Coordinates of C-alpha atoms in Angstrom, one line a residue:
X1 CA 96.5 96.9 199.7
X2 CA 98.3 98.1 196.5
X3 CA 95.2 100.0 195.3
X4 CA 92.6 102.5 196.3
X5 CA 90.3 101.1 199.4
X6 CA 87.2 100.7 197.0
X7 CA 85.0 97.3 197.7
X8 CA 84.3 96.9 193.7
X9 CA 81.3 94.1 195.4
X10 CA 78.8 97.2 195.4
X11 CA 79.4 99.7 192.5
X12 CA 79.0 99.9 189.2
X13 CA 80.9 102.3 186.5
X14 CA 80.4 104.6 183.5
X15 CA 82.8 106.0 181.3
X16 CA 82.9 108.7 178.2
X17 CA 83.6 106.4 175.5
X18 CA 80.8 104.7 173.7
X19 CA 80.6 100.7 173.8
X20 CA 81.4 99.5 170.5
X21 CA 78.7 96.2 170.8
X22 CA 75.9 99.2 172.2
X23 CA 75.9 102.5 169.5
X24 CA 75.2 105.6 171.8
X25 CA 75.4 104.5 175.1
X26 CA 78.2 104.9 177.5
X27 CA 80.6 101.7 178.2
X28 CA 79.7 100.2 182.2
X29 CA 80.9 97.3 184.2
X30 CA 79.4 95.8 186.6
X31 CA 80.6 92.6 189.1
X32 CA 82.2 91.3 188.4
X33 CA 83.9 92.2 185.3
X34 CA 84.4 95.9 187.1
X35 CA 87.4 94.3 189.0
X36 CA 89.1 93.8 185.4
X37 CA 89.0 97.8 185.0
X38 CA 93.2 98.4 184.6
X39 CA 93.2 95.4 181.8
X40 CA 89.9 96.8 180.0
X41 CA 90.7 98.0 176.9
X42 CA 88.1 100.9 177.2
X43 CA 87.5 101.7 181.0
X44 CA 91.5 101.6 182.0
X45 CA 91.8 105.0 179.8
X46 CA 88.8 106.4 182.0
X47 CA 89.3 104.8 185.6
X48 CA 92.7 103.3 186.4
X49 CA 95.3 103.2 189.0
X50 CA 98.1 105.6 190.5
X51 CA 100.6 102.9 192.5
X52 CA 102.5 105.7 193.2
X53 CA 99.7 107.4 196.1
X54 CA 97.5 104.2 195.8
X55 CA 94.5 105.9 193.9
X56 CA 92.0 105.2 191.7
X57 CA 91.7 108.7 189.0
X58 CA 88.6 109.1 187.6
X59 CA 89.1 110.9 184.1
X60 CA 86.0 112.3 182.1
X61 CA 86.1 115.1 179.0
X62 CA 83.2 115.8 176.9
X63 CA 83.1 112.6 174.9
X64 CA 79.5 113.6 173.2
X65 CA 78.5 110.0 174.9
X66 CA 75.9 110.6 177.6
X67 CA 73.2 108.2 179.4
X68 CA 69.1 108.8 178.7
X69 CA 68.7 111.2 182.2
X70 CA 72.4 112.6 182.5
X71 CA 73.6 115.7 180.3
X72 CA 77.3 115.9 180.6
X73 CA 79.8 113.2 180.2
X74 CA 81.4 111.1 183.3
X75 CA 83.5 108.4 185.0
X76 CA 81.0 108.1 187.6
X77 CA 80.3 105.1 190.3
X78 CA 76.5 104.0 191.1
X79 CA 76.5 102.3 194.1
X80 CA 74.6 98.5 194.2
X81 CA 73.5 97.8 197.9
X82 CA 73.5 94.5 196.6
X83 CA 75.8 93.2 194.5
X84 CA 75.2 92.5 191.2
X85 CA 71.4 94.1 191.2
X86 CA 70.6 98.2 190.1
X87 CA 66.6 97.3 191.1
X88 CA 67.9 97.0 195.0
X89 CA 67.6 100.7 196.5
X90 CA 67.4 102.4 200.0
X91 CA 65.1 105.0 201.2
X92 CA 65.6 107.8 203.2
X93 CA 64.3 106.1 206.2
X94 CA 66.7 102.4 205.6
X95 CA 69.2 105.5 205.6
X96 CA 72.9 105.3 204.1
X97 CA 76.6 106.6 204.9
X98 CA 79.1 107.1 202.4
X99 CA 82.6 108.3 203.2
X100 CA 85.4 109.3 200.6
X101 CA 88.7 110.4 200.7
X102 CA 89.2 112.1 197.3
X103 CA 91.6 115.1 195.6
X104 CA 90.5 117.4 192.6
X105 CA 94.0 116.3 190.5
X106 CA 93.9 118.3 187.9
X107 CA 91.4 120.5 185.9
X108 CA 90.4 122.3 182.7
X109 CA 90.3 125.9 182.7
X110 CA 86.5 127.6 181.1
X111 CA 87.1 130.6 178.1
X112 CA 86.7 133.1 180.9
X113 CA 89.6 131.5 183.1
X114 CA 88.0 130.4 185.8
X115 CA 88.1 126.6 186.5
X116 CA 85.5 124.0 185.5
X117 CA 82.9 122.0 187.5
X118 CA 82.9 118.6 188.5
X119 CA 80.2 116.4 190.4
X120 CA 82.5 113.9 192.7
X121 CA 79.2 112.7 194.5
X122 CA 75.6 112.3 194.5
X123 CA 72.2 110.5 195.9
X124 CA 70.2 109.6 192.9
X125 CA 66.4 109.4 193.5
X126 CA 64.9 105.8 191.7
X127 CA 61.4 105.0 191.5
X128 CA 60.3 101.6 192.1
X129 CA 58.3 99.5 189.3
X130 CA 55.5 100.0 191.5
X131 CA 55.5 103.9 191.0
X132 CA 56.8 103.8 187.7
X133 CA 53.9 102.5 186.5
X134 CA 51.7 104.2 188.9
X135 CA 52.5 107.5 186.3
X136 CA 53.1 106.1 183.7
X137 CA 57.0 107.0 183.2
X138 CA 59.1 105.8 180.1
X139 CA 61.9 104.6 183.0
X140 CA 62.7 104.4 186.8
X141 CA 64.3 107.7 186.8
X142 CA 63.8 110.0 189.8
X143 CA 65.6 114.0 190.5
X144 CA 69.1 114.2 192.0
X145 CA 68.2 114.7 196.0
X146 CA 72.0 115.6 196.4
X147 CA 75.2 117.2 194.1
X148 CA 78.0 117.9 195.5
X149 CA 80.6 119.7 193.5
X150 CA 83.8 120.9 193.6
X151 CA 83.3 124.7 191.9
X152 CA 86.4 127.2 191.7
X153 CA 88.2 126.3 195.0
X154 CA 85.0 125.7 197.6
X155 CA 82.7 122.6 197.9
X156 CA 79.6 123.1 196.9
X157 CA 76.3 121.5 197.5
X158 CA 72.9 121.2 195.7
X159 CA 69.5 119.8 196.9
X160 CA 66.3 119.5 195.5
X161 CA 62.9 121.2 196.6
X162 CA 59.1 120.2 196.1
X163 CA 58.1 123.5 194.3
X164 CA 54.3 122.8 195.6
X165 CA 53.9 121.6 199.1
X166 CA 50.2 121.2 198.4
X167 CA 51.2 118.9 195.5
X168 CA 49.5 115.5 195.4
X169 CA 51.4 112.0 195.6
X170 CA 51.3 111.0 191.8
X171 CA 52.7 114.2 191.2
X172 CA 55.0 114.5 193.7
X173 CA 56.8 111.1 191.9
X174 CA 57.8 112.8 188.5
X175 CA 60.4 115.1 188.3
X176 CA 59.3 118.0 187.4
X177 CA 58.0 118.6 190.7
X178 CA 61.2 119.2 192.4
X179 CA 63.7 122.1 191.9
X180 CA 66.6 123.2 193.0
X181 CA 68.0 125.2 195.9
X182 CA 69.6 128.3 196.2
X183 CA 73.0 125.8 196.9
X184 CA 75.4 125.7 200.1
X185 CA 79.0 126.3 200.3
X186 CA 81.5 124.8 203.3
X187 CA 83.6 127.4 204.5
X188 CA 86.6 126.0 204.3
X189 CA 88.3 127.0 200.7
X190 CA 89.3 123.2 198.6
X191 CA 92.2 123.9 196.9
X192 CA 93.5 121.2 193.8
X193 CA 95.9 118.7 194.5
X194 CA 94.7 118.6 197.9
X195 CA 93.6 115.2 199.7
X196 CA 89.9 115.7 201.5
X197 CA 87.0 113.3 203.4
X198 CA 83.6 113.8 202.4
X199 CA 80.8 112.0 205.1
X200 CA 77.1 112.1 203.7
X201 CA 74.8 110.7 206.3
X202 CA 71.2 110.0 205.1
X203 CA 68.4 109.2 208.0
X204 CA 64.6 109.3 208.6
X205 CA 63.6 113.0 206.7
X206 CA 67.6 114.0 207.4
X207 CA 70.6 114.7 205.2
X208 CA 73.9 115.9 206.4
X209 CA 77.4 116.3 204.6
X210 CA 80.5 116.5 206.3
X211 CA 83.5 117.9 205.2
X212 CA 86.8 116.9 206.5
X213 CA 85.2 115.6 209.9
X214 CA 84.3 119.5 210.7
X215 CA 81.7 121.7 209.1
X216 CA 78.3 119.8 208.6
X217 CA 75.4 121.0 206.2
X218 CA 72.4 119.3 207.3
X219 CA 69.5 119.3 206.1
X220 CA 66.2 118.2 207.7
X221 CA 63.0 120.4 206.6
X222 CA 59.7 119.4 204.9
X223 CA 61.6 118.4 201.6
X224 CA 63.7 115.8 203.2
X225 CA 60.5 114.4 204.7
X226 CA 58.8 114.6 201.4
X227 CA 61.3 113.0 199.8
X228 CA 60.7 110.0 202.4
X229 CA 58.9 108.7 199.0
X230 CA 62.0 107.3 197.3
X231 CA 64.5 104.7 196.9
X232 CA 67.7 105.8 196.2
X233 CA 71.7 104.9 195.6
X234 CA 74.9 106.7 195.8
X235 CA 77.2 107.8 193.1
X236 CA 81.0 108.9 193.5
X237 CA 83.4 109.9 191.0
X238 CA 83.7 112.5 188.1
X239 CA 80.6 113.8 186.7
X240 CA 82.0 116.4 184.5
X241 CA 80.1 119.5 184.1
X242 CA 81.4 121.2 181.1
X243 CA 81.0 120.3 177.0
X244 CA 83.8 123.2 176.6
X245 CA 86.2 121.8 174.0
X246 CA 88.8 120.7 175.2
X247 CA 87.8 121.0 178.8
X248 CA 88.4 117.7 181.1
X249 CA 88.9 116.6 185.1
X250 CA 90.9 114.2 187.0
X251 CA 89.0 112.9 190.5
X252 CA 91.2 110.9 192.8
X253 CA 89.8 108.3 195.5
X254 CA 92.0 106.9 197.6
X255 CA 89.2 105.1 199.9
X256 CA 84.9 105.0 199.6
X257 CA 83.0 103.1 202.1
X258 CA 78.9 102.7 201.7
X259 CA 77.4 101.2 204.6
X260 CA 73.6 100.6 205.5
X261 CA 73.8 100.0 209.3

Protein backbone atom coordinates (compact mmCIF):
# COMPACT_ATOMS: atom_id res chain seq x y z
CA UNK A 1 0.00 0.00 0.00
CA UNK A 2 1.05 3.65 -0.67
CA UNK A 3 -0.38 4.83 2.74
CA UNK A 4 -0.35 4.10 6.42
CA UNK A 5 -1.97 0.39 7.26
CA UNK A 6 -5.17 2.05 8.77
CA UNK A 7 -8.68 0.12 7.85
CA UNK A 8 -10.65 3.74 7.63
CA UNK A 9 -14.02 0.87 7.74
CA UNK A 10 -13.91 1.30 11.69
CA UNK A 11 -12.80 4.82 12.89
CA UNK A 12 -13.94 7.99 12.92
CA UNK A 13 -11.81 11.46 13.17
CA UNK A 14 -11.74 14.85 14.90
CA UNK A 15 -9.74 17.78 14.09
CA UNK A 16 -8.96 21.42 15.69
CA UNK A 17 -10.71 23.47 13.22
CA UNK A 18 -14.37 24.28 13.73
CA UNK A 19 -16.93 23.08 10.99
CA UNK A 20 -18.14 25.94 9.22
CA UNK A 21 -22.02 24.30 8.74
CA UNK A 22 -21.75 23.43 12.87
CA UNK A 23 -20.48 26.87 15.08
CA UNK A 24 -18.43 25.44 17.99
CA UNK A 25 -17.91 22.03 17.35
CA UNK A 26 -14.92 20.27 16.07
CA UNK A 27 -14.95 19.12 12.18
CA UNK A 28 -15.33 14.75 11.99
CA UNK A 29 -15.71 12.32 9.32
CA UNK A 30 -16.97 9.40 9.44
CA UNK A 31 -17.38 6.28 6.51
CA UNK A 32 -17.22 6.86 4.38
CA UNK A 33 -16.39 10.33 3.62
CA UNK A 34 -13.11 9.73 6.20
CA UNK A 35 -11.45 7.93 3.18
CA UNK A 36 -11.57 11.49 1.33
CA UNK A 37 -9.32 12.94 4.29
CA UNK A 38 -6.07 14.19 1.81
CA UNK A 39 -8.72 16.06 -0.65
CA UNK A 40 -10.82 17.53 2.47
CA UNK A 41 -10.47 21.00 2.49
CA UNK A 42 -10.40 21.02 6.39
CA UNK A 43 -9.17 17.59 7.70
CA UNK A 44 -6.06 17.28 5.06
CA UNK A 45 -4.36 20.29 7.14
CA UNK A 46 -4.95 18.15 10.38
CA UNK A 47 -4.60 14.35 9.25
CA UNK A 48 -2.80 13.74 5.90
CA UNK A 49 -0.18 11.64 4.34
CA UNK A 50 3.75 11.39 4.38
CA UNK A 51 4.44 9.12 0.88
CA UNK A 52 7.83 9.57 1.73
CA UNK A 53 7.77 6.78 5.19
CA UNK A 54 4.06 5.86 4.30
CA UNK A 55 2.37 7.68 7.39
CA UNK A 56 -0.46 9.19 8.30
CA UNK A 57 0.62 12.63 10.78
CA UNK A 58 -1.71 13.60 13.06
CA UNK A 59 -1.30 17.45 13.72
CA UNK A 60 -3.23 19.23 16.62
CA UNK A 61 -2.45 22.94 18.28
CA UNK A 62 -4.64 24.65 20.57
CA UNK A 63 -7.38 25.69 18.11
CA UNK A 64 -9.83 26.99 21.10
CA UNK A 65 -12.29 24.18 19.30
CA UNK A 66 -12.99 21.37 21.76
CA UNK A 67 -15.85 18.58 22.00
CA UNK A 68 -18.68 18.77 25.06
CA UNK A 69 -16.41 16.01 27.54
CA UNK A 70 -12.75 16.80 26.04
CA UNK A 71 -10.63 19.89 27.28
CA UNK A 72 -7.75 20.29 24.97
CA UNK A 73 -7.78 20.29 21.28
CA UNK A 74 -6.99 16.99 19.01
CA UNK A 75 -6.63 15.03 15.71
CA UNK A 76 -7.83 12.04 17.43
CA UNK A 77 -9.46 8.56 15.97
CA UNK A 78 -12.56 6.87 17.85
CA UNK A 79 -12.74 3.58 16.90
CA UNK A 80 -16.47 2.15 15.43
CA UNK A 81 -16.54 -1.75 16.03
CA UNK A 82 -19.01 -1.45 13.40
CA UNK A 83 -18.81 0.59 10.70
CA UNK A 84 -20.69 3.43 10.33
CA UNK A 85 -22.38 3.25 14.07
CA UNK A 86 -20.80 5.24 17.46
CA UNK A 87 -23.93 3.41 19.62
CA UNK A 88 -21.99 -0.12 18.89
CA UNK A 89 -19.43 -0.52 21.94
CA UNK A 90 -17.47 -3.45 23.67
CA UNK A 91 -17.14 -4.24 27.23
CA UNK A 92 -14.41 -5.25 29.19
CA UNK A 93 -15.49 -8.83 29.08
CA UNK A 94 -16.24 -8.85 24.71
CA UNK A 95 -12.48 -7.63 25.30
CA UNK A 96 -10.43 -5.68 22.51
CA UNK A 97 -6.71 -5.44 21.03
CA UNK A 98 -5.36 -2.52 19.49
CA UNK A 99 -1.82 -2.41 18.03
CA UNK A 100 0.01 0.77 16.60
CA UNK A 101 3.11 1.54 15.23
CA UNK A 102 3.53 5.24 15.81
CA UNK A 103 6.59 8.09 16.23
CA UNK A 104 6.34 11.39 18.31
CA UNK A 105 7.50 13.62 15.00
CA UNK A 106 7.85 16.66 16.24
CA UNK A 107 6.82 18.69 19.33
CA UNK A 108 6.34 22.14 21.03
CA UNK A 109 8.50 23.05 23.76
CA UNK A 110 6.35 24.45 27.36
CA UNK A 111 7.71 28.25 28.83
CA UNK A 112 9.86 26.14 31.18
CA UNK A 113 11.61 24.15 28.34
CA UNK A 114 10.56 20.96 28.89
CA UNK A 115 8.50 19.31 26.13
CA UNK A 116 4.68 19.14 25.83
CA UNK A 117 2.17 16.28 26.32
CA UNK A 118 0.31 14.43 23.96
CA UNK A 119 -2.40 11.51 24.33
CA UNK A 120 -1.61 9.06 21.23
CA UNK A 121 -4.19 6.48 22.69
CA UNK A 122 -7.02 5.78 24.84
CA UNK A 123 -10.16 3.46 25.96
CA UNK A 124 -13.11 5.69 26.34
CA UNK A 125 -15.80 4.44 28.85
CA UNK A 126 -19.62 5.00 27.02
CA UNK A 127 -22.72 4.37 28.80
CA UNK A 128 -25.41 2.68 27.09
CA UNK A 129 -29.05 4.41 26.62
CA UNK A 130 -30.15 2.07 29.10
CA UNK A 131 -27.78 3.64 31.92
CA UNK A 132 -27.97 6.94 30.65
CA UNK A 133 -31.24 7.17 31.54
CA UNK A 134 -30.98 5.07 34.55
CA UNK A 135 -29.13 8.54 36.17
CA UNK A 136 -30.37 10.73 34.44
CA UNK A 137 -27.19 12.03 32.42
CA UNK A 138 -27.31 14.99 29.84
CA UNK A 139 -25.22 12.42 27.31
CA UNK A 140 -23.60 8.89 27.08
CA UNK A 141 -20.33 10.00 28.39
CA UNK A 142 -18.36 7.72 30.65
CA UNK A 143 -14.38 8.47 32.40
CA UNK A 144 -11.24 7.63 30.39
CA UNK A 145 -10.42 3.82 31.73
CA UNK A 146 -7.04 4.35 29.86
CA UNK A 147 -4.41 7.49 28.70
CA UNK A 148 -1.49 6.80 27.42
CA UNK A 149 0.92 9.61 26.75
CA UNK A 150 3.95 10.30 25.47
CA UNK A 151 5.45 12.90 28.41
CA UNK A 152 9.19 14.30 28.18
CA UNK A 153 10.88 11.16 26.63
CA UNK A 154 9.06 8.02 28.57
CA UNK A 155 5.58 6.50 27.89
CA UNK A 156 3.33 7.11 30.28
CA UNK A 157 0.07 5.55 31.39
CA UNK A 158 -3.04 6.66 33.26
CA UNK A 159 -6.03 4.62 34.69
CA UNK A 160 -8.92 5.39 36.51
CA UNK A 161 -9.92 4.18 40.14
CA UNK A 162 -13.53 3.78 41.95
CA UNK A 163 -12.72 6.27 44.77
CA UNK A 164 -15.48 4.23 46.98
CA UNK A 165 -15.48 0.47 46.72
CA UNK A 166 -18.57 0.44 48.91
CA UNK A 167 -20.19 2.76 46.27
CA UNK A 168 -23.54 1.59 44.86
CA UNK A 169 -24.32 0.83 41.06
CA UNK A 170 -26.09 4.08 40.04
CA UNK A 171 -23.32 5.78 41.40
CA UNK A 172 -20.79 3.86 40.26
CA UNK A 173 -22.13 4.90 36.37
CA UNK A 174 -21.35 8.74 36.64
CA UNK A 175 -18.07 9.98 36.52
CA UNK A 176 -17.37 11.51 39.32
CA UNK A 177 -16.97 8.26 40.96
CA UNK A 178 -13.75 7.31 39.38
CA UNK A 179 -10.25 9.08 39.82
CA UNK A 180 -7.20 8.77 38.72
CA UNK A 181 -4.06 6.76 39.54
CA UNK A 182 -0.85 7.64 40.77
CA UNK A 183 0.28 6.78 36.74
CA UNK A 184 2.92 4.15 35.32
CA UNK A 185 5.88 4.70 33.35
CA UNK A 186 7.64 1.85 30.84
CA UNK A 187 11.17 1.70 31.48
CA UNK A 188 12.41 2.00 28.42
CA UNK A 189 13.17 6.01 27.57
CA UNK A 190 10.89 7.07 23.97
CA UNK A 191 12.92 9.39 22.34
CA UNK A 192 11.16 11.76 19.21
CA UNK A 193 11.61 10.82 15.82
CA UNK A 194 11.71 7.39 16.86
CA UNK A 195 9.35 4.51 15.31
CA UNK A 196 7.52 2.34 18.39
CA UNK A 197 4.45 -0.58 18.74
CA UNK A 198 2.07 0.03 21.29
CA UNK A 199 -0.25 -3.46 22.11
CA UNK A 200 -3.29 -2.76 24.53
CA UNK A 201 -5.04 -5.97 25.30
CA UNK A 202 -8.46 -5.65 27.18
CA UNK A 203 -10.05 -8.96 28.72
CA UNK A 204 -12.59 -10.19 31.47
CA UNK A 205 -11.52 -7.50 34.67
CA UNK A 206 -7.88 -7.30 32.75
CA UNK A 207 -5.91 -4.54 30.99
CA UNK A 208 -2.39 -4.74 29.75
CA UNK A 209 -0.21 -2.41 27.51
CA UNK A 210 2.67 -3.43 25.75
CA UNK A 211 5.42 -1.55 24.65
CA UNK A 212 7.54 -2.52 21.76
CA UNK A 213 6.57 -6.34 22.26
CA UNK A 214 8.65 -6.16 25.84
CA UNK A 215 7.64 -4.48 29.01
CA UNK A 216 3.86 -5.11 29.87
CA UNK A 217 1.79 -2.99 32.52
CA UNK A 218 -1.10 -4.97 33.41
CA UNK A 219 -3.54 -4.28 35.21
CA UNK A 220 -6.14 -6.65 36.77
CA UNK A 221 -7.39 -5.50 40.40
CA UNK A 222 -10.90 -4.65 41.79
CA UNK A 223 -11.17 -1.51 39.43
CA UNK A 224 -10.75 -3.36 36.26
CA UNK A 225 -13.55 -5.71 37.60
CA UNK A 226 -15.54 -2.82 38.54
CA UNK A 227 -15.29 -1.29 35.54
CA UNK A 228 -16.77 -4.67 34.00
CA UNK A 229 -19.94 -2.15 33.93
CA UNK A 230 -19.07 -0.44 30.65
CA UNK A 231 -19.06 -0.39 27.03
CA UNK A 232 -16.27 1.11 25.66
CA UNK A 233 -14.15 2.12 22.15
CA UNK A 234 -10.68 2.94 21.35
CA UNK A 235 -9.13 6.12 20.32
CA UNK A 236 -5.54 6.65 18.67
CA UNK A 237 -3.96 9.70 17.54
CA UNK A 238 -3.02 13.20 18.85
CA UNK A 239 -4.85 14.38 21.78
CA UNK A 240 -2.92 17.42 22.54
CA UNK A 241 -2.39 18.32 26.04
CA UNK A 242 -1.35 21.85 26.09
CA UNK A 243 -3.43 25.42 25.39
CA UNK A 244 0.31 27.06 25.56
CA UNK A 245 0.32 29.57 22.58
CA UNK A 246 1.87 28.46 20.20
CA UNK A 247 2.40 25.05 21.45
CA UNK A 248 1.50 22.05 18.85
CA UNK A 249 2.43 18.00 18.10
CA UNK A 250 2.86 15.86 15.17
CA UNK A 251 1.80 11.93 15.89
CA UNK A 252 2.80 9.56 13.06
CA UNK A 253 0.93 5.99 12.43
CA UNK A 254 2.32 4.00 10.17
CA UNK A 255 -0.08 0.85 10.94
CA UNK A 256 -3.35 0.48 13.72
CA UNK A 257 -5.14 -2.76 13.86
CA UNK A 258 -8.44 -3.14 16.32
CA UNK A 259 -9.60 -6.52 16.49
CA UNK A 260 -12.40 -8.19 18.73
CA UNK A 261 -11.52 -11.88 18.55
Amino acid sequence: SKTAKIDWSHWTVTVPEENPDKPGKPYSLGYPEILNYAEDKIASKYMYDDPKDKSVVFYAFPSGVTTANTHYSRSELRETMETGSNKVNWTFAKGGKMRGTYAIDDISKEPDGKYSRVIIAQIHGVLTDEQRDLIGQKDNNAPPILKVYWDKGKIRVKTKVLKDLNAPYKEMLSEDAWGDDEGRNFKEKIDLNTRFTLEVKVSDGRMEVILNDTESLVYDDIHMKKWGIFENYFKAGNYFQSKTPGTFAKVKIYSLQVTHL
